[PDB]
Amino acid sequence: SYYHHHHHHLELSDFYDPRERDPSVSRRPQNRQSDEWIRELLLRGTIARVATLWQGEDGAAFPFITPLAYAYRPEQGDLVYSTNVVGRLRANAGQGHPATLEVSEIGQFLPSNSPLELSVQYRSVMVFGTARVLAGEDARAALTTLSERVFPGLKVGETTRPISEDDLKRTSVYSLSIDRWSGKENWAEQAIQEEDWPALGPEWLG
Amino acid sequence: SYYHHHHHHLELSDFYDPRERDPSVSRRPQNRQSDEWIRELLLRGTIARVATLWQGEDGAAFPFITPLAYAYRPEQGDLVYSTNVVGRLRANAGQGHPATLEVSEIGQFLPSNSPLELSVQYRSVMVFGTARVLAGEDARAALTTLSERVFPGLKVGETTRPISEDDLKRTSVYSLSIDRWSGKENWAEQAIQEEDWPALGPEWLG
């Protein structure tokens, strides 16, 4: 019968078979990384995206995403950045506002002959905390650190004129005080391939 | 008197003086761009960040930011992407959820001898809409478009085995239906400099 036949046709596991393992490699699930790795990623990055919540037409909070220069200040336990982007009203009670900050390193797209193994090399950190606008000498110091970090060798007050009070009045400089963070890496040399489908040609991996 | 002296010392405008203008250049304020420019940016990009809202420990909504491969489908009026990243509960009433998607092109940091003119060349689009998980042939078609877009020349079912039902069961594929969008460019060849402070050395602009 068709029924039985089809059932039979509807009707195995690399997962459990021999492989090589470097014992020094992270055993953390879900691509998660250590707190030290996160620190290092944040220290060497220069561009972040920041998401904060604004009240929308419908009264509901919704997020903006803004790419911007940033600097991690590990002693202070914050990240600093400058932007004059705003919405109408923040969806927030307070003098500070919750903010999520993301920093990534995006490598190469990794081709495969298995469509769900198609990937992209990445390292990515989400930082969760509370951002507050800085004033006066706090703002000037944060802007200096920021500027000097993202322009290595530049010195405010030598390379550039000093940061004036007018500059400060015209600029919004924030400190995002860190509560928690979450880091991920998937930086394979090659995507997982399917042995039982024709291999990718030289054009892909060569 | 000190008072009078200081007042006197506390105590001009390129803004209004001759300049050259290309009449073909956008006159839109605040670095804003046209809808056509936005379309083109989205069509040529491959990486986006998506922000969606999740309920936090404190009951308050907060955003995640996830970098991912995407594809703009202009006829359908959506963007497609695939990710298995989640939180606990979405901060959302519904079978879809509001989502903000950002795509940028980040150029070079632009040095200046004026500290507030330090910048970074960028093009950036925010897309606001509602994302919904796809199923069945809808999911398979979206994943195909996605894969073929970000791997030019790859053909699902030739280059790769076809997308199976198992693949679909293991994958979350979304359509972000576009409501509105917002585009910005600031892609100068050189930052604004201050004439009245020593010029940047050859090391900076050379």
Side-chain angles (χ1 to χ4, degrees), chain B residues 75-118:
Chain B
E75 184 148 57
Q76 289 89 331
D78 70 12
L79 308 120
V80 297
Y81 54 86
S82 176
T83 174
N84 282 3
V85 171
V86 293
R88 191 52 52 187
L89 292 168
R90 299 183 180 274
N92 175 250
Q95 266 178 332
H97 52 268
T100 301
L101 181 143
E102 189 259 341
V103 175
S104 23
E105 294 179 354
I106 303 313
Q108 301 310 310
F109 278 98
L110 303 170
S112 186
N113 65 352
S114 175
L116 270 295
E117 296 294 353
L118 292 171

mmCIF file of all heavy atoms in Angstrom, chain B residues 75-118:
data_model
loop_
_atom_site.group_PDB
_atom_site.id
_atom_site.type_symbol
_atom_site.label_atom_id
_atom_site.label_comp_id
_atom_site.label_asym_id
_atom_site.label_seq_id
_atom_site.Cartn_x
_atom_site.Cartn_y
_atom_site.Cartn_z
ATOM 1 N N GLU B 75 9.866 44.456 -3.267
ATOM 2 C CA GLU B 75 8.471 44.242 -3.706
ATOM 3 C C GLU B 75 7.516 43.869 -2.572
ATOM 4 O O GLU B 75 6.369 44.373 -2.460
ATOM 5 C CB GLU B 75 8.458 43.155 -4.738
ATOM 6 C CG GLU B 75 7.047 42.980 -5.274
ATOM 7 C CD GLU B 75 7.045 42.562 -6.707
ATOM 8 O OE1 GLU B 75 7.660 41.517 -7.001
ATOM 9 O OE2 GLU B 75 6.429 43.276 -7.525
ATOM 10 N N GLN B 76 7.998 42.947 -1.739
ATOM 11 C CA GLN B 76 7.268 42.447 -0.565
ATOM 12 C C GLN B 76 7.153 43.530 0.517
ATOM 13 O O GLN B 76 6.303 43.509 1.412
ATOM 14 C CB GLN B 76 7.948 41.244 0.053
ATOM 15 C CG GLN B 76 7.855 39.980 -0.752
ATOM 16 C CD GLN B 76 8.953 39.790 -1.749
ATOM 17 O OE1 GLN B 76 9.539 40.754 -2.281
ATOM 18 N NE2 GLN B 76 9.265 38.521 -2.025
ATOM 19 N N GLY B 77 8.069 44.474 0.444
ATOM 20 C CA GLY B 77 8.129 45.527 1.467
ATOM 21 C C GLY B 77 8.656 45.063 2.800
ATOM 22 O O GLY B 77 8.251 45.541 3.873
ATOM 23 N N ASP B 78 9.613 44.159 2.725
ATOM 24 C CA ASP B 78 10.205 43.637 3.950
ATOM 25 C C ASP B 78 11.693 43.380 3.845
ATOM 26 O O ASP B 78 12.307 43.507 2.797
ATOM 27 C CB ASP B 78 9.429 42.413 4.454
ATOM 28 C CG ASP B 78 9.598 41.169 3.565
ATOM 29 O OD1 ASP B 78 10.484 41.167 2.674
ATOM 30 O OD2 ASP B 78 8.837 40.172 3.809
ATOM 31 N N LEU B 79 12.228 43.072 5.003
ATOM 32 C CA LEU B 79 13.583 42.535 5.147
ATOM 33 C C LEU B 79 13.485 41.199 5.812
ATOM 34 O O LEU B 79 12.629 40.980 6.703
ATOM 35 C CB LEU B 79 14.452 43.472 6.001
ATOM 36 C CG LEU B 79 14.406 44.898 5.468
ATOM 37 C CD1 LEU B 79 13.881 45.855 6.488
ATOM 38 C CD2 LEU B 79 15.759 45.292 5.043
ATOM 39 N N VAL B 80 14.310 40.288 5.348
ATOM 40 C CA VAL B 80 14.393 38.967 5.924
ATOM 41 C C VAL B 80 15.724 38.707 6.588
ATOM 42 O O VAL B 80 16.790 39.182 6.150
ATOM 43 C CB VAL B 80 14.067 37.826 4.876
ATOM 44 C CG1 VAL B 80 12.641 37.965 4.407
ATOM 45 C CG2 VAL B 80 14.995 37.861 3.660
ATOM 46 N N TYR B 81 15.674 37.935 7.665
ATOM 47 C CA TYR B 81 16.860 37.533 8.422
ATOM 48 C C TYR B 81 16.544 36.306 9.265
ATOM 49 O O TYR B 81 15.389 35.994 9.441
ATOM 50 C CB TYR B 81 17.358 38.659 9.348
ATOM 51 C CG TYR B 81 16.324 39.225 10.294
ATOM 52 C CD1 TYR B 81 16.084 38.621 11.535
ATOM 53 C CD2 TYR B 81 15.586 40.375 9.981
ATOM 54 C CE1 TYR B 81 15.193 39.143 12.407
ATOM 55 C CE2 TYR B 81 14.666 40.907 10.868
ATOM 56 C CZ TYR B 81 14.463 40.256 12.085
ATOM 57 O OH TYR B 81 13.539 40.759 13.012
ATOM 58 N N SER B 82 17.591 35.657 9.713
ATOM 59 C CA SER B 82 17.458 34.396 10.455
ATOM 60 C C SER B 82 18.315 34.491 11.721
ATOM 61 O O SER B 82 19.467 34.871 11.657
ATOM 62 C CB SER B 82 17.881 33.222 9.573
ATOM 63 O OG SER B 82 17.853 31.998 10.297
ATOM 64 N N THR B 83 17.730 34.168 12.863
ATOM 65 C CA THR B 83 18.504 34.132 14.116
ATOM 66 C C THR B 83 17.720 33.351 15.147
ATOM 67 O O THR B 83 16.501 33.470 15.224
ATOM 68 C CB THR B 83 18.770 35.575 14.714
ATOM 69 O OG1 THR B 83 19.395 35.508 16.004
ATOM 70 C CG2 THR B 83 17.487 36.381 14.876
ATOM 71 N N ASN B 84 18.457 32.603 15.963
ATOM 72 C CA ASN B 84 17.836 31.840 17.043
ATOM 73 C C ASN B 84 18.086 32.514 18.407
ATOM 74 O O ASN B 84 17.842 31.922 19.447
ATOM 75 C CB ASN B 84 18.289 30.381 17.041
ATOM 76 C CG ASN B 84 17.570 29.557 15.963
ATOM 77 O OD1 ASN B 84 16.784 30.085 15.183
ATOM 78 N ND2 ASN B 84 17.856 28.275 15.903
ATOM 79 N N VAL B 85 18.516 33.767 18.382
ATOM 80 C CA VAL B 85 18.712 34.527 19.625
ATOM 81 C C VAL B 85 17.385 34.974 20.183
ATOM 82 O O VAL B 85 16.530 35.468 19.448
ATOM 83 C CB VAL B 85 19.618 35.769 19.390
ATOM 84 C CG1 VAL B 85 19.651 36.684 20.623
ATOM 85 C CG2 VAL B 85 21.043 35.300 18.994
ATOM 86 N N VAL B 86 17.188 34.706 21.472
ATOM 87 C CA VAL B 86 15.992 35.136 22.169
ATOM 88 C C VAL B 86 16.344 35.546 23.593
ATOM 89 O O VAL B 86 17.435 35.306 24.071
ATOM 90 C CB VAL B 86 14.958 34.011 22.231
ATOM 91 C CG1 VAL B 86 14.442 33.692 20.826
ATOM 92 C CG2 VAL B 86 15.492 32.765 23.045
ATOM 93 N N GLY B 87 15.355 36.124 24.258
ATOM 94 C CA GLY B 87 15.459 36.394 25.702
ATOM 95 C C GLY B 87 14.498 35.435 26.373
ATOM 96 O O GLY B 87 14.334 34.299 25.941
ATOM 97 N N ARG B 88 13.759 35.952 27.346
ATOM 98 C CA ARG B 88 12.776 35.144 28.081
ATOM 99 C C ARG B 88 11.435 35.319 27.401
ATOM 100 O O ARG B 88 11.087 34.611 26.477
ATOM 101 C CB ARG B 88 12.779 35.579 29.551
ATOM 102 C CG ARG B 88 12.024 34.673 30.475
ATOM 103 C CD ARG B 88 12.461 33.232 30.330
ATOM 104 N NE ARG B 88 13.905 33.050 30.435
ATOM 105 C CZ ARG B 88 14.513 31.885 30.193
ATOM 106 N NH1 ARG B 88 13.798 30.825 29.841
ATOM 107 N NH2 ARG B 88 15.821 31.765 30.308
ATOM 108 N N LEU B 89 10.728 36.368 27.778
ATOM 109 C CA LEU B 89 9.522 36.791 27.103
ATOM 110 C C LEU B 89 9.716 38.105 26.344
ATOM 111 O O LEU B 89 10.370 39.031 26.844
ATOM 112 C CB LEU B 89 8.377 36.955 28.110
ATOM 113 C CG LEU B 89 7.842 35.699 28.771
ATOM 114 C CD1 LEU B 89 6.956 36.110 29.929
ATOM 115 C CD2 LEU B 89 7.089 34.776 27.782
ATOM 116 N N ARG B 90 9.140 38.171 25.142
ATOM 117 C CA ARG B 90 9.155 39.437 24.401
ATOM 118 C C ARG B 90 8.267 40.404 25.116
ATOM 119 O O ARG B 90 7.251 39.991 25.727
ATOM 120 C CB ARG B 90 8.650 39.275 22.957
ATOM 121 C CG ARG B 90 9.489 38.328 22.115
ATOM 122 C CD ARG B 90 8.993 38.260 20.710
ATOM 123 N NE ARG B 90 9.818 37.348 19.933
ATOM 124 C CZ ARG B 90 10.957 37.670 19.317
ATOM 125 N NH1 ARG B 90 11.452 38.898 19.310
ATOM 126 N NH2 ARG B 90 11.614 36.717 18.672
ATOM 127 N N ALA B 91 8.621 41.669 25.042
ATOM 128 C CA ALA B 91 7.799 42.755 25.612
ATOM 129 C C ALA B 91 6.913 43.259 24.509
ATOM 130 O O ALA B 91 7.216 44.272 23.846
ATOM 131 C CB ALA B 91 8.650 43.893 26.131
ATOM 132 N N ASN B 92 5.875 42.485 24.254
ATOM 133 C CA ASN B 92 5.060 42.612 23.067
ATOM 134 C C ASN B 92 3.754 41.850 23.202
ATOM 135 O O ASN B 92 3.719 40.696 23.644
ATOM 136 C CB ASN B 92 5.874 42.054 21.862
ATOM 137 C CG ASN B 92 5.095 42.019 20.608
ATOM 138 O OD1 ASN B 92 4.734 40.942 20.111
ATOM 139 N ND2 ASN B 92 4.829 43.190 20.055
ATOM 140 N N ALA B 93 2.689 42.504 22.763
ATOM 141 C CA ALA B 93 1.397 41.860 22.585
ATOM 142 C C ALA B 93 1.268 41.466 21.122
ATOM 143 O O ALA B 93 1.240 42.341 20.260
ATOM 144 C CB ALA B 93 0.265 42.812 22.963
ATOM 145 N N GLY B 94 1.228 40.163 20.851
ATOM 146 C CA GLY B 94 1.098 39.680 19.460
ATOM 147 C C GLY B 94 1.929 38.553 18.905
ATOM 148 O O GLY B 94 2.907 38.066 19.480
ATOM 149 N N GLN B 95 1.495 38.178 17.707
ATOM 150 C CA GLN B 95 2.128 37.156 16.857
ATOM 151 C C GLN B 95 3.291 37.719 16.035
ATOM 152 O O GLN B 95 4.025 36.970 15.360
ATOM 153 C CB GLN B 95 1.109 36.618 15.857
ATOM 154 C CG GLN B 95 0.363 35.367 16.260
ATOM 155 C CD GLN B 95 -0.649 34.992 15.191
ATOM 156 O OE1 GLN B 95 -1.146 35.867 14.473
ATOM 157 N NE2 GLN B 95 -0.962 33.696 15.077
ATOM 158 N N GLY B 96 3.375 39.042 16.018
ATOM 159 C CA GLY B 96 4.541 39.752 15.466
ATOM 160 C C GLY B 96 5.078 40.608 16.588
ATOM 161 O O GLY B 96 4.459 40.695 17.654
ATOM 162 N N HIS B 97 6.224 41.243 16.371
ATOM 163 C CA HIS B 97 6.820 42.125 17.381
ATOM 164 C C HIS B 97 7.470 43.334 16.654
ATOM 165 O O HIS B 97 8.053 43.197 15.579
ATOM 166 C CB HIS B 97 7.864 41.369 18.229
ATOM 167 C CG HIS B 97 8.902 40.650 17.429
ATOM 168 N ND1 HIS B 97 8.746 39.332 17.046
ATOM 169 C CD2 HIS B 97 10.120 41.035 16.980
ATOM 170 C CE1 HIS B 97 9.813 38.953 16.364
ATOM 171 N NE2 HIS B 97 10.675 39.960 16.322
ATOM 172 N N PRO B 98 7.366 44.517 17.228
ATOM 173 C CA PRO B 98 8.079 45.662 16.640
ATOM 174 C C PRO B 98 9.572 45.420 16.637
ATOM 175 O O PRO B 98 10.133 44.801 17.537
ATOM 176 C CB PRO B 98 7.700 46.846 17.560
ATOM 177 C CG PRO B 98 6.539 46.365 18.386
ATOM 178 C CD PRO B 98 6.581 44.866 18.425
ATOM 179 N N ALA B 99 10.198 45.876 15.562
ATOM 180 C CA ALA B 99 11.647 45.692 15.413
ATOM 181 C C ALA B 99 12.222 46.906 14.705
ATOM 182 O O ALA B 99 11.582 47.512 13.841
ATOM 183 C CB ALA B 99 11.969 44.429 14.653
ATOM 184 N N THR B 100 13.408 47.292 15.144
ATOM 185 C CA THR B 100 14.174 48.313 14.451
ATOM 186 C C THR B 100 15.381 47.636 13.823
ATOM 187 O O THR B 100 16.006 46.831 14.448
ATOM 188 C CB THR B 100 14.648 49.373 15.442
ATOM 189 O OG1 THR B 100 13.509 49.967 16.099
ATOM 190 C CG2 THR B 100 15.454 50.464 14.731
ATOM 191 N N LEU B 101 15.665 47.937 12.574
ATOM 192 C CA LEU B 101 16.798 47.365 11.859
ATOM 193 C C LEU B 101 17.687 48.481 11.340
ATOM 194 O O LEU B 101 17.212 49.450 10.792
ATOM 195 C CB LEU B 101 16.300 46.476 10.690
ATOM 196 C CG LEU B 101 17.356 45.770 9.841
ATOM 197 C CD1 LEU B 101 16.856 44.391 9.433
ATOM 198 C CD2 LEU B 101 17.781 46.588 8.630
ATOM 199 N N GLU B 102 18.979 48.342 11.577
ATOM 200 C CA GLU B 102 19.953 49.324 11.131
ATOM 201 C C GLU B 102 20.994 48.734 10.192
ATOM 202 O O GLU B 102 21.476 47.658 10.443
ATOM 203 C CB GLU B 102 20.692 49.852 12.368
ATOM 204 C CG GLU B 102 21.580 51.024 12.124
ATOM 205 C CD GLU B 102 23.042 50.764 12.007
ATOM 206 O OE1 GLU B 102 23.515 49.683 12.454
ATOM 207 O OE2 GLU B 102 23.696 51.729 11.508
ATOM 208 N N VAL B 103 21.260 49.454 9.106
ATOM 209 C CA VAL B 103 22.318 49.097 8.164
ATOM 210 C C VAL B 103 23.184 50.336 7.950
ATOM 211 O O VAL B 103 22.667 51.426 7.796
ATOM 212 C CB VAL B 103 21.712 48.634 6.824
ATOM 213 C CG1 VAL B 103 22.800 48.367 5.752
ATOM 214 C CG2 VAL B 103 20.811 47.390 7.047
ATOM 215 N N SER B 104 24.494 50.159 8.031
ATOM 216 C CA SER B 104 25.428 51.264 7.880
ATOM 217 C C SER B 104 26.613 50.881 6.985
ATOM 218 O O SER B 104 26.914 49.683 6.732
ATOM 219 C CB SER B 104 25.935 51.807 9.238
ATOM 220 O OG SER B 104 25.857 50.888 10.317
ATOM 221 N N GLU B 105 27.236 51.926 6.468
ATOM 222 C CA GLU B 105 28.545 51.849 5.821
ATOM 223 C C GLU B 105 29.390 52.828 6.618
ATOM 224 O O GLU B 105 28.998 53.972 6.780
ATOM 225 C CB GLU B 105 28.464 52.275 4.370
ATOM 226 C CG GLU B 105 27.613 51.277 3.561
ATOM 227 C CD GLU B 105 27.427 51.575 2.088
ATOM 228 O OE1 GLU B 105 27.855 52.640 1.571
ATOM 229 O OE2 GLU B 105 26.845 50.704 1.414
ATOM 230 N N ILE B 106 30.436 52.321 7.237
ATOM 231 C CA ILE B 106 31.340 53.135 8.086
ATOM 232 C C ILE B 106 32.651 53.287 7.345
ATOM 233 O O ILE B 106 33.250 52.299 6.942
ATOM 234 C CB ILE B 106 31.532 52.518 9.484
ATOM 235 C CG1 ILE B 106 30.181 52.327 10.216
ATOM 236 C CG2 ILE B 106 32.527 53.369 10.368
ATOM 237 C CD1 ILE B 106 29.239 53.475 10.195
ATOM 238 N N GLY B 107 33.049 54.534 7.093
ATOM 239 C CA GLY B 107 34.301 54.804 6.376
ATOM 240 C C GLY B 107 35.415 55.046 7.365
ATOM 241 O O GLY B 107 35.586 54.308 8.342
ATOM 242 N N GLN B 108 36.169 56.108 7.074
ATOM 243 C CA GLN B 108 37.332 56.448 7.855
ATOM 244 C C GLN B 108 37.045 57.494 8.905
ATOM 245 O O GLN B 108 36.187 58.352 8.717
ATOM 246 C CB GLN B 108 38.438 56.968 6.962
ATOM 247 C CG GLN B 108 38.887 55.990 5.881
ATOM 248 C CD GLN B 108 39.205 54.599 6.386
ATOM 249 O OE1 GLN B 108 39.960 54.410 7.351
ATOM 250 N NE2 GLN B 108 38.579 53.631 5.801
ATOM 251 N N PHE B 109 37.815 57.395 9.982
ATOM 252 C CA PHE B 109 37.853 58.423 10.999
ATOM 253 C C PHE B 109 38.541 59.636 10.328
ATOM 254 O O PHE B 109 39.537 59.491 9.601
ATOM 255 C CB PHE B 109 38.597 57.959 12.274
ATOM 256 C CG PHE B 109 37.746 57.140 13.194
ATOM 257 C CD1 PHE B 109 37.801 55.779 13.186
ATOM 258 C CD2 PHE B 109 36.890 57.768 14.093
ATOM 259 C CE1 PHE B 109 36.972 55.027 14.053
ATOM 260 C CE2 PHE B 109 36.068 57.028 14.958
ATOM 261 C CZ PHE B 109 36.127 55.667 14.930
ATOM 262 N N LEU B 110 37.984 60.815 10.578
ATOM 263 C CA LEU B 110 38.442 62.034 9.956
ATOM 264 C C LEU B 110 39.063 62.947 11.019
ATOM 265 O O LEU B 110 38.378 63.477 11.845
ATOM 266 C CB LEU B 110 37.291 62.747 9.248
ATOM 267 C CG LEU B 110 36.514 61.963 8.158
ATOM 268 C CD1 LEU B 110 35.220 62.731 7.696
ATOM 269 C CD2 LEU B 110 37.490 61.604 7.046
ATOM 270 N N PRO B 111 40.382 63.083 11.004
ATOM 271 C CA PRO B 111 41.046 63.881 12.013
ATOM 272 C C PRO B 111 40.861 65.351 11.769
ATOM 273 O O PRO B 111 40.646 65.791 10.634
ATOM 274 C CB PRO B 111 42.505 63.466 11.910
ATOM 275 C CG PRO B 111 42.658 63.045 10.506
ATOM 276 C CD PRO B 111 41.329 62.484 10.054
ATOM 277 N N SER B 112 40.980 66.100 12.865
ATOM 278 C CA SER B 112 40.849 67.572 12.858
ATOM 279 C C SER B 112 41.659 68.153 13.982
ATOM 280 O O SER B 112 41.865 67.524 14.992
ATOM 281 C CB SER B 112 39.419 68.051 13.060
ATOM 282 O OG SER B 112 39.294 69.455 12.904
ATOM 283 N N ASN B 113 42.029 69.418 13.807
ATOM 284 C CA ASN B 113 42.615 70.179 14.890
ATOM 285 C C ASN B 113 41.580 70.901 15.702
ATOM 286 O O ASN B 113 41.928 71.647 16.611
ATOM 287 C CB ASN B 113 43.708 71.154 14.397
ATOM 288 C CG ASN B 113 43.162 72.229 13.492
ATOM 289 O OD1 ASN B 113 42.006 72.191 13.102
ATOM 290 N ND2 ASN B 113 44.006 73.273 13.220
ATOM 291 N N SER B 114 40.308 70.604 15.434
ATOM 292 C CA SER B 114 39.212 71.066 16.277
ATOM 293 C C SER B 114 38.521 69.846 16.916
ATOM 294 O O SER B 114 38.068 68.940 16.201
ATOM 295 C CB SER B 114 38.254 71.875 15.499
ATOM 296 O OG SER B 114 37.161 72.205 16.333
ATOM 297 N N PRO B 115 38.490 69.796 18.262
ATOM 298 C CA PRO B 115 38.120 68.522 18.856
ATOM 299 C C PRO B 115 36.670 68.147 18.601
ATOM 300 O O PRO B 115 36.349 66.961 18.617
ATOM 301 C CB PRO B 115 38.374 68.759 20.355
ATOM 302 C CG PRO B 115 38.257 70.200 20.512
ATOM 303 C CD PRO B 115 38.850 70.775 19.302
ATOM 304 N N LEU B 116 35.794 69.112 18.373
ATOM 305 C CA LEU B 116 34.402 68.705 18.152
ATOM 306 C C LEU B 116 34.084 68.403 16.696
ATOM 307 O O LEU B 116 32.966 67.982 16.357
ATOM 308 C CB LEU B 116 33.419 69.623 18.845
ATOM 309 C CG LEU B 116 33.140 69.102 20.288
ATOM 310 C CD1 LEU B 116 32.419 67.733 20.269
ATOM 311 C CD2 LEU B 116 34.405 68.955 21.123
ATOM 312 N N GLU B 117 35.111 68.547 15.846
ATOM 313 C CA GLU B 117 34.957 68.290 14.399
ATOM 314 C C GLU B 117 35.512 66.926 14.028
ATOM 315 O O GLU B 117 35.397 66.486 12.888
ATOM 316 C CB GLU B 117 35.591 69.372 13.566
ATOM 317 C CG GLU B 117 34.954 70.749 13.712
ATOM 318 C CD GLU B 117 33.528 70.812 13.185
ATOM 319 O OE1 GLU B 117 33.039 69.837 12.574
ATOM 320 O OE2 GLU B 117 32.890 71.870 13.397
ATOM 321 N N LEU B 118 36.161 66.287 14.993
ATOM 322 C CA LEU B 118 36.579 64.876 14.893
ATOM 323 C C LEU B 118 35.328 64.117 14.497
ATOM 324 O O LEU B 118 34.277 64.281 15.076
ATOM 325 C CB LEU B 118 37.155 64.365 16.206
ATOM 326 C CG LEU B 118 38.486 64.989 16.576
ATOM 327 C CD1 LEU B 118 38.824 64.552 17.994
ATOM 328 C CD2 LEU B 118 39.645 64.624 15.594
#
